[PDB]
Amino acid sequence: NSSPPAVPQAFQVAHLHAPTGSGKSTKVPAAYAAQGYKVLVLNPSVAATLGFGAYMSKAHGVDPNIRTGVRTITTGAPITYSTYGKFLADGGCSGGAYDIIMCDECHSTDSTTILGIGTVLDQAETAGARLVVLATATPPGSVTVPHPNIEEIALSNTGEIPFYGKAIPIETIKGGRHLIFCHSKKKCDELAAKLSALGIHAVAYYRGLDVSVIPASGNVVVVATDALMTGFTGDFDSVIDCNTCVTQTVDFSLDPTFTIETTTMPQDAVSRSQRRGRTSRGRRGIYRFVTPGERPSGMFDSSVLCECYDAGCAWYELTPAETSVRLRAYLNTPGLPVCQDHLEFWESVFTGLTHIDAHFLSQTKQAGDNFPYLVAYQATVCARAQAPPPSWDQMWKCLTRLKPTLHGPTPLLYRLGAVQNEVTLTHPITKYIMACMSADLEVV
Ligand SMILES: O=S(=O)(O)c1ccc([NH+]=C2C=CC(=C(c3ccc(Nc4cccc(S(=O)(=O)O)c4)cc3)c3ccc(Nc4cccc(S(=O)(=O)O)c4)cc3)C=C2)cc1
């Protein structure tokens, strides 16, 4: 729906589909507050959370409470803005705290948002909340739609420059400023170089480099990865999309258990719109693609589920069972992103990961990398077996100081990236996870 759901006598979960800026996260809550309700707005971004608070006090004479992982500001106002992570850090809902609870960007598929939303969905009513709103500008199942200012031209085989099974006719990049999207930070160099060697001024671009490496004037063909901003100065004439992106995915490769790496999946609606949106700003744009079909938005990998249990164990003092109750509340609620139901599986997996090294965990938590609990656990297992990590990549930095006293094969519990060192598959925990996969009628 495009209108703020009225407040119900008892309870209700409603949906709010509105664009960013129409005031769905500010004006809407302000109205609920003018009515005497106490409102809590959750968002994935610290910046956004701050953005709403500023807007509110500056436009509606209301200095709302703002809560983030860094700190919380309390003004005693009836409106409160918090990040999902801080909300969870806080234990979730607090009795008699809020009448309404809006879950903004509820289409987000990062583990913190999903877990946070599950939490709201499960505790809201017990918490005395009368209403829970699932707000978002990108409803699940969305598809890229036609834009009034963008001409979409499909790539064909004709063209000297080969491009993902299709071709890029030189004619289309000779003159003007064009943005080409490639999936791998490498594939970029492969293209920028082929075009530079054809008279075409092309400057590659991917994570690491600087914005400066992109002249702001004169013809140019920028071959980049999604590293390029979404709000950065577009002013592009045409964008060529490879229609594929790199994303985190879980593979039950039975070697010995599972693998969580980054794979290239077909691009989805949200992705397609964002890349296409890099053209036709203040003028008419061109959009060339290799593939028309796209996966609708609102779908996420099983590995995010894993990421949710990992987080419940690492930061929120949540047993794998508690996480499940919360994640289940999320899967039973229609209108939110979907994923294969692997709750039982992941639950049983983390449950077996007991007696984790506190110091290692604390090291992975603040280190900031993904899956701090699984990294720390694989390390705990390693140290206890005086074995080295699967690799000496930054991932395993918490084991650097014992490097000397670590010999023999690595007791691989699972694969979280490149595994160089030799590996043994005889560890009880490895055997425990292997069995978790066999005990499942939807896993293996
Ligand atoms: O819908 S509503 O009508 O209710 C409404 C009302 C008011 C709104 N205000 C906003 C204000 C700011 C922002 C974001 C933001 C974007 C850029 C920012 N830039 C600064 C630049 C210079 C100085 C500052 S300073 O000094 O911190 O004040 C900030 C700051 C904040 C900001 C924008 C997009 C963001 N995008 C992300 C995209 C991907 C991932 C993330 S993540 O960090 O992973 O959460 C964030 C993050 C932050 C978003 C919204 C917004 C909406």
PDB file of C-alpha atoms and ligand atoms in Angstrom, residues 19-27 44-48 51-52 55 230, ligand 1:
ATOM      1  CA  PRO A  19       9.518   5.937  -2.448  1.00  0.00           C
ATOM      2  CA  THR A  20      12.461   7.312  -0.485  1.00  0.00           C
ATOM      3  CA  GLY A  21      11.750  10.961   0.178  1.00  0.00           C
ATOM      4  CA  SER A  22       7.962  10.895   0.168  1.00  0.00           C
ATOM      5  CA  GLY A  23       8.276  11.057   3.966  1.00  0.00           C
ATOM      6  CA  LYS A  24       7.424   7.435   4.754  1.00  0.00           C
ATOM      7  CA  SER A  25      10.103   7.321   7.440  1.00  0.00           C
ATOM      8  CA  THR A  26       9.613  10.817   8.761  1.00  0.00           C
ATOM      9  CA  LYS A  27       6.255  12.469   7.931  1.00  0.00           C
ATOM     10  CA  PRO A  44      19.717  -0.754   8.183  1.00  0.00           C
ATOM     11  CA  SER A  45      21.856   2.397   7.960  1.00  0.00           C
ATOM     12  CA  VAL A  46      23.401   4.460  10.758  1.00  0.00           C
ATOM     13  CA  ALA A  47      23.621   7.348   8.289  1.00  0.00           C
ATOM     14  CA  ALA A  48      19.963   7.106   7.312  1.00  0.00           C
ATOM     15  CA  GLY A  51      19.390  11.561   8.316  1.00  0.00           C
ATOM     16  CA  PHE A  52      15.811  11.121   9.554  1.00  0.00           C
ATOM     17  CA  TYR A  55      15.104  16.110   8.938  1.00  0.00           C
ATOM     18  CA  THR A 230      24.732   4.973  -6.510  1.00  0.00           C
TER      19      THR A 230
HETATM   20  O1  LIG B   1      11.896   8.644   3.141  1.00  0.00           O
HETATM   21  S1  LIG B   1      11.813   9.906   3.948  1.00  0.00           S
HETATM   22  O2  LIG B   1      11.017  10.931   3.197  1.00  0.00           O
HETATM   23  O3  LIG B   1      11.131   9.624   5.255  1.00  0.00           O
HETATM   24  C1  LIG B   1      13.437  10.498   4.236  1.00  0.00           C
HETATM   25  C2  LIG B   1      13.663  11.630   5.015  1.00  0.00           C
HETATM   26  C3  LIG B   1      14.962  12.087   5.229  1.00  0.00           C
HETATM   27  C4  LIG B   1      16.050  11.418   4.675  1.00  0.00           C
HETATM   28  N1  LIG B   1      17.283  11.860   4.930  1.00  0.00           N
HETATM   29  C5  LIG B   1      18.425  11.283   4.546  1.00  0.00           C
HETATM   30  C6  LIG B   1      19.645  11.889   4.833  1.00  0.00           C
HETATM   31  C7  LIG B   1      20.845  11.217   4.610  1.00  0.00           C
HETATM   32  C8  LIG B   1      20.857   9.920   4.099  1.00  0.00           C
HETATM   33  C9  LIG B   1      22.045   9.241   3.827  1.00  0.00           C
HETATM   34  C10 LIG B   1      23.264   9.918   3.839  1.00  0.00           C
HETATM   35  C11 LIG B   1      23.939  10.042   2.628  1.00  0.00           C
HETATM   36  C12 LIG B   1      25.075  10.839   2.537  1.00  0.00           C
HETATM   37  C13 LIG B   1      25.551  11.528   3.649  1.00  0.00           C
HETATM   38  N2  LIG B   1      26.534  12.391   3.388  1.00  0.00           N
HETATM   39  C14 LIG B   1      27.177  13.297   4.123  1.00  0.00           C
HETATM   40  C15 LIG B   1      27.982  14.167   3.394  1.00  0.00           C
HETATM   41  C16 LIG B   1      28.570  15.279   3.987  1.00  0.00           C
HETATM   42  C17 LIG B   1      28.361  15.512   5.342  1.00  0.00           C
HETATM   43  C18 LIG B   1      27.577  14.637   6.088  1.00  0.00           C
HETATM   44  S2  LIG B   1      27.570  14.852   7.824  1.00  0.00           S
HETATM   45  O4  LIG B   1      28.743  15.705   8.210  1.00  0.00           O
HETATM   46  O5  LIG B   1      27.703  13.514   8.490  1.00  0.00           O
HETATM   47  O6  LIG B   1      26.298  15.516   8.260  1.00  0.00           O
HETATM   48  C19 LIG B   1      26.972  13.537   5.481  1.00  0.00           C
HETATM   49  C20 LIG B   1      24.900  11.377   4.872  1.00  0.00           C
HETATM   50  C21 LIG B   1      23.763  10.574   4.964  1.00  0.00           C
HETATM   51  C22 LIG B   1      22.004   7.932   3.344  1.00  0.00           C
HETATM   52  C23 LIG B   1      21.428   7.698   2.099  1.00  0.00           C
HETATM   53  C24 LIG B   1      21.525   6.446   1.499  1.00  0.00           C
HETATM   54  C25 LIG B   1      22.204   5.408   2.129  1.00  0.00           C
HETATM   55  N3  LIG B   1      22.462   4.342   1.367  1.00  0.00           N
HETATM   56  C26 LIG B   1      23.067   3.178   1.603  1.00  0.00           C
HETATM   57  C27 LIG B   1      23.167   2.334   0.499  1.00  0.00           C
HETATM   58  C28 LIG B   1      23.706   1.058   0.613  1.00  0.00           C
HETATM   59  C29 LIG B   1      24.149   0.620   1.857  1.00  0.00           C
HETATM   60  C30 LIG B   1      24.053   1.451   2.968  1.00  0.00           C
HETATM   61  S3  LIG B   1      24.574   0.812   4.513  1.00  0.00           S
HETATM   62  O7  LIG B   1      25.695   1.649   5.054  1.00  0.00           O
HETATM   63  O8  LIG B   1      25.059  -0.596   4.330  1.00  0.00           O
HETATM   64  O9  LIG B   1      23.428   0.807   5.481  1.00  0.00           O
HETATM   65  C31 LIG B   1      23.516   2.731   2.846  1.00  0.00           C
HETATM   66  C32 LIG B   1      22.755   5.626   3.389  1.00  0.00           C
HETATM   67  C33 LIG B   1      22.653   6.881   3.990  1.00  0.00           C
HETATM   68  C34 LIG B   1      19.635   9.315   3.814  1.00  0.00           C
HETATM   69  C35 LIG B   1      18.438   9.990   4.030  1.00  0.00           C
HETATM   70  C36 LIG B   1      15.811  10.280   3.905  1.00  0.00           C
HETATM   71  C37 LIG B   1      14.517   9.821   3.678  1.00  0.00           C
END
